[PDB]
Every structure is written in C-alpha cells, then in structure tokens.
C-alpha cells in the first residue's frame, strides 16, 4: 500500500492550455482554410505526442496539404493569442511573459532557413570538397600564427 510506487514520480505530463468552442470567438479573427476541427485535431495531437513536430505531422491525418511550418506557425499564434487573452485582466510576467516573447517567431524566416539548408546539402561534390580543403588549410595556417607574427615583426 506504498502508494508512491516509484516511477509515478515521472508520470509528468506536459501542460498545454486548451480551447473549447466558446473560446473560438477569440480565435475567430485568426490555402490555409483553418477551422475549428483542424485546430482541435492539432491540439489533441500536440497533447498526446509531447510536441515532437515530425511525429505530429506524420500522425496527422486531416488533410495532407498541411506543411511543417504552417502547423508550427498556427500552433504558436493560437497559443500566444490564448495566453495574452489570459493575461489580459492580470498582467503576465516572469516565465510566462518570457514564453510570450519567444513566440514572436516568423514562418518565412524558417522556410528560408530550411531552403538554405537544403541548397547547401544539394551542392556538388567538388564545391564541398573545396570548402573542406579551405577549412583544413585555414586551420593549418591558424596553428602557427605566433611564429609567423614574430617573424613578421622581426622582418
């Protein structure tokens, strides 16, 4: 009857404030074609799987046009709007204000980031071999900076 069977200590659950049909009035203002069903499906997926974006998009089944950054942006804006609507009467600070701050994200930057990373990963073997050789030679010249500087000073 040692109710604290151990391992219950870790029954920690990630907390995400939820929305109902009534609160969608605050969310009414915000090829997207978002609606109540898609939003609630997204929130159920994010509550079940502990916010792992690739697994959430893979287990997503409402419709396939939804892309990673679209889901991320919609989730972040919904969360920040709800939280602000929830700190309206009593101003929010500390940790919660700090999350609100970070969530001033931007979807365009990342697609630019992802496109940039894909472009770099798609480079030809010769170019990346040249880049590696440049880095190696730069470090080789790096390792002997002191002697070169002293010799230049003497000369």
């Amino acid at each position: 009857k040692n109710s604290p069977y151990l391992f219950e200590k870790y029954n920690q659950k990630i907390q995400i404030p939820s929305f109902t049909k009534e609160e969608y009035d605050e969310f009414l203002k915000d090829e997207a074609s978002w609606d109540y069903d898609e939003t609630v499906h997204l929130f159920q997926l994010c509550e079940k799987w502990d916010l792992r974006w690739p697994i959430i998009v893979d287990r997503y089944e409402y419709d396939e046009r939804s892309m990673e950054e679209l889901k991320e942006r919609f989730y972040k804006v919904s969360e920040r709007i709800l939280r602000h609507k929830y700190r309206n009467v009593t101003m929010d600070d500390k940790t919660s204000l700090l999350v609100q701050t970070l969530s001033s994200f931007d979807k365009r930057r990342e697609t630019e980031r992802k496109q940039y990373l894909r472009r770099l990963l798609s480079r030809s073997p010769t170019e990346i071999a040249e880049e590696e050789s440049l880095v190696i030679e730069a470090r080789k010249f790096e390792l002997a900076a002191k002697k070169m500087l002293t010799e230049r000073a003497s000369l």
């Binding site: 870790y10 029954n11 920690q12 659950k13 990630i14 907390q15 995400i16 502990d50 916010l51 991320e72 940790t95 700090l98 999350v99 970070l102 969530s103 994200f105 930057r109 990342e110 630019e112 980031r113 940039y116 990373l117 770099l120 480079r123 170019e127 990346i128 880049e131 440049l134 880095v135 030679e137 730069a138 010249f141 070169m148 010799e151 230049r152 000369l155």
Partner: protein, 75 residues
C-alpha cells in the same frame, strides 16, 4: 598582414635578403588569398560554417515528459 604587406617592402629593400624573407612573403600572400576565397564563398551564401539561427520550442526545454524519463531508463 594586410595593414602593411611585405611584398611592398621587399623590392624596396636596402639590406641583404634571405630565403626566409621570401618564405614569409609567400606565406602572407597565401593568407591573403585564402581569406579572399573565404569571403567570396561567404558572399555567395554557399558557406556551410554560416547558417541561420534555428527556432527553439519554449515548451520542450522546460519540463521533462514521461517519454524522456523512459528514454533515460532506456539508455
């Protein structure tokens, strides 16, 4: 090295030269060309060492979920 290159001094020398002086001049020339190529690669946005900063989810980094404890026991 580029605040005052040695290749300007060497033709204007008034003292006996040595192989070592030319060694140093060639080495600083290699420094200059390597940095120029590095800058040219960086300008074309084809430099792997320079990447945009990635977004971080505020929720994940705060608290440990059950799955992460299970993965600790895993490892």
């Amino acid at each position: 090295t580029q605040t005052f290159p040695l290749a300007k001094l060497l033709p204007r020398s008034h003292k006996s030269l040595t192989t070592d002086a030319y060694e140093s001049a060639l080495l600083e020339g290699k420094i200059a060309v390597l940095y120029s190529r590095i800058e040219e690669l960086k300008r074309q946005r084809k430099w792997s060492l320079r990447q945009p900063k990635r977004f971080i989810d505020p929720f994940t980094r705060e608290s440990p979920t059950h799955w992460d404890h299970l993965l600790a026991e895993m490892k």
